[PDB]
Design a protein around this ligand. Structure first.
Ligand code: MG
Ligand code: MG
Ligand code: MG
Ligand code: MG
Ligand code: MG
Ligand code: MG
Length: 136
RNA sequence: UUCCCGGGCCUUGUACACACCGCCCGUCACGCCAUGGGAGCGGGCUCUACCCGAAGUCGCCGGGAGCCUACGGGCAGGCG
């Protein structure tokens, strides 16, 4: 027995070091790349378009426009190749997956996605709190 | 003395004048050139309508928040 508990044992690859976010709010993920036997940390930053929750190997995809072409990247949420991920802004999604933005991509999405104050306000307030409460 | 040939004088018509064995016209054939049309093909300029929209000035907001304050202000920022 413990069919899932065994496969759930299987991960020493879970990682707690990355931030909370949901679809709709924009983030920036730094990712190890090769680029000809050298090594670089490339950043990729756009709206997170969706999140697939499987526990370990959940994955989340990020969309942005780059030099006049939309791009989506799909990252494994536990990937050993993610150095860090910063949330660069929060936004109010209204539904789980937003693919609908692909056929907007214009000003109409900054109207559809207006920033989520509740989670913004609780970020600052969480950052003031942890800042004040570490030192003294 | 009508007719054929040549000739003389006057006259008349002429686009002939190396002068009627003159001049000249239009198709057709050939060569060269330029040009119209032509299923279309390419390009330039332009107009109309609608979508998206940089930088920017302008206008409204500056609030569940920021910063400075000379705080019933200004700034970042947001929207048009
Ligand atoms: Mg079990
Ligand atoms: Mg005569
Ligand atoms: Mg003759
Ligand atoms: Mg002659
Ligand atoms: Mg022609
Ligand atoms: Mg517009």
């Amino acid at each position: 027995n413990r069919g899932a508990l065994i496969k759930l044992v299987e991960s020493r690859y879970v990682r707690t070091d990355l931030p909370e976010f949901r679809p709709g709010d924009t983030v920036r993920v730094s990712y190890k790349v090769k680029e000809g036997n050298r090594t670089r940390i490339q950043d990729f930053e756009g709206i997170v378009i969706r999140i697939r929750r499987n526990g370990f190997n959940t994955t989340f995809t990020v969309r942005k426009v780059s030099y006049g072409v939309g791009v989506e990247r799909i990252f494994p949420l536990h990937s050993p190749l993610i150095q860090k991920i910063d949330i660069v802004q929060r936004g109010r999604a209204r539904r789980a997956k937003l693919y609908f933005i692909r056929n907007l991509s214009d000003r109409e999405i900054r109207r559809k996605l207006r920033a989520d104050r509740k989670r913004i306000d609780q970020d600052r307030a969480a950052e003031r709190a942890a800042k004040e409460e570490a030192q003294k």
